[PDB]
Design a protein around this ligand. Structure first.
Ligand SMILES: [Cl-]
Lengths: 105, 105
């Protein structure tokens, strides 16, 4: 699974992760994806570690959105629209090819 | 949400759908994406209309995989690996720019 800027591979952090296929400057858009949004009570345990929540709603990011791993020292950030319908991942520091792209906890 | 070959837009079939940005030949790969796989009982009602199931396991396709709409007269098909970890969408007939890409039921 990949495109012109990122590729998904096995990550040392466990499971799968998103890696840069090209260089990224700070603040550059890495991924923009749509999310499926539903009341918190509609979600089972299946996607607990991937869902993003706000109030009584949770959203599952499609595209590459849910694949980005978390980290105590991330090089990217996620951003969600008001209704949690769209997610964007931006770099918060330069990123070189082969480096894993991670977001905060 | 889009890439060099497909774009997501509102579909007359309801909600969102995946549309062709370029022409597709018969049998051409439209999308390849990873899926999150969990026991059927781990899933709530949230994604029941998107999940693909085999035996006691269900899988949620990431990338553009879960966005393709279903149709009685589709122009594409889906294919899952044995463990349901990867999904591929292939055209089953030529597809022209602007046409919605749909799969069977
Ligand atoms: Cl769920």
């Amino acid at each position: 699974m990949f495109n012109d800027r990122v590729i998904v591979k096995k990550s040392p952090l466990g499971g799968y992760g998103v890696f840069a296929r090209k260089s990224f400057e700070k603040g550059e858009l890495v991924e923009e994806c749509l999310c499926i949004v539903r009341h918190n009570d509609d979600w089972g345990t299946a996607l607990e570690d991937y869902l993003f929540s706000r109030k009584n709603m949770s959203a599952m990011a499609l595209g590459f959105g849910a694949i980005f791993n978390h980290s105590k020292d991330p090089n990217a950030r996620h951003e969600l629209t008001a209704g949690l319908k769209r997610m964007r991942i931006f770099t918060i520091k330069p990123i070189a090819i082969g480096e894993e792209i991670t977001i905060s906890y």
